[PDB]
Ligand binder design. Structure first.
Ligand SMILES: *C(=O)[C@@H](C1=N[C@H](C(=O)O)[C@H](SCC(=O)OCCC)[C@@H]1C)[C@@H](C)O
Length: 351
């Protein structure tokens, strides 16, 4: 003797409906005979009705600042039911776009953190972290930590195991990231951890030793930072690499015209900190390399050793500098994540 029932995921009259989720309508004691959704201009949204006729759902992205009208009719054996629902979606003050590293499909070293950089300051860090789904295989515990107002990083306690798949789903579209700011879009990346490559620069020997899966494969005489501009000790993540680059001290805050400044074109340069530490070709210091520290902070090595390093070291490999007269690389450098104690990194700084 029964009347079909409709259940929609939105209510007639709702405002600030968030656009992170599809809109659905379900029939009970009947099936769906017509479902249309239309924006404020009359333009159809459309979606998919399940084969059994019980569940309809939008299949495309719904937009910010829209007024949508949903019409639905369920026919039962015991009669009909029609509903019309009109609702408004979120109206952002601003949009932020995330950027993920490392690159999709890349193979990286064991020190590569997952990085989500937003193009605006994030007022609700908690909401951002909750929108980011990380899958690891083999599964391994990790945690988020913020390097600044825009960039959050995720990593395990220890260096990744080689062969780990890492999947990163940044599901920020439709999510309120605080003070009126909503994600511009979703982004996705997937990467894999490659060989373990750790290079150690010991100031006691002035040798940079590259170890691949625990074996020494290269031993590089090096000249590090002179006593007045020493190389900071600690763990550096390998970033980008250049056949040649102009090193401009202005990039890192220091005027070229200034006393500690510089502008020099160099070869075979591998970046290991945002503060501007590189491993690079230094033909002028070949005689100092292995003996005395002469640089601004860079790991000077021979031209063939620098090119070797460019060819054999990858994004996410590790350089550890030890025994220098300098301090420790900042944990928030950009490439100094591993210098923050796990207890502190785990507890995070979302609040
Ligand atoms: C390589 O020599 C680079 C260079 N490395 C350092 C560094 O270790 O930061 C310098 S000096 C920055 C500083 O504040 O030193 C203390 C002196 C008061 C610079 C970034 C260049 C060629 O990229």
């Amino acid at each position: 003797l029964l009347v079909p029932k409709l259940t929609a995921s939105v209510t007639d009259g709702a405002v600030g409906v968030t656009v992170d989720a599809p809109v659905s309508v379900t029939a009970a004691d009947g099936v769906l005979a017509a479902v249309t959704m239309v924006n404020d201009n009359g333009r159809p949204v459309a979606g998919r009705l399940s084969p059994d006729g019980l569940r309809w759902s939008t299949t495309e992205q719904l937009g910010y600042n829209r007024r949508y009208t949903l019409n639905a009719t369920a026919l039962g054996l015991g009669g009909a039911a029609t509903r019309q629902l009109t609702f408004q979606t979120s109206s952002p003050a601003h949009l932020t776009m995330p950027y993920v590293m490392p690159g999709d499909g890349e193979v990286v070293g064991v020190g590569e953190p997952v990085a989500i950089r937003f193009d605006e300051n994030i007022a609700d860090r908690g909401a951002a972290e909750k929108a980011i789904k990380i899958t690891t295989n083999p599964p391994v515990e990790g945690a988020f930590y913020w390097l600044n107002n825009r960039e959050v990083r995720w990593r395990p306690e220890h260096f990744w195991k080689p062969g780990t798949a890492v999947d990163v789903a940044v599901n920020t579209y439709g999510v309120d990231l605080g003070e009126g700011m909503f994600g511009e879009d979703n982004v996705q990346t997937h990467f894999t951890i490659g060989d373990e490559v750790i290079a150690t620069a010991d100031d006691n020997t002035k040798i940079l030793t590259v170890r691949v899966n625990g074996e020494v494969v290269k031993s590089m005489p090096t000249s590090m930072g002179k006593d007045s501009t020493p190389t900071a000790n600690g763990i550096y993540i390998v970033g980008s690499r250049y056949k040649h680059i102009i090193m401009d001290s202005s990039t890192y805050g220091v005027p070229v015209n200034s006393p500690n400044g510089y502008r020099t074109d160099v070869d075979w340069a591998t970046q290991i900190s945002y503060s501007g530490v590189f491993v690079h070709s230094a033909p002028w210091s070949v005689g100092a390399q292995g003996h005395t520290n002469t640089s601004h902070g860079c790991l000077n090595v021979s031209p063939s050793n620098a090119q070797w390093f460019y060819d054999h070291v990858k994004r996410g490999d590790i350089v550890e500098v030890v025994n220098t007269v300098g301090g420790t690389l900042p944990g928030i450098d950009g490439l100094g994540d591993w210098n923050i104690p796990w207890d502190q990194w785990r507890a995070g700084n979302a609040k």
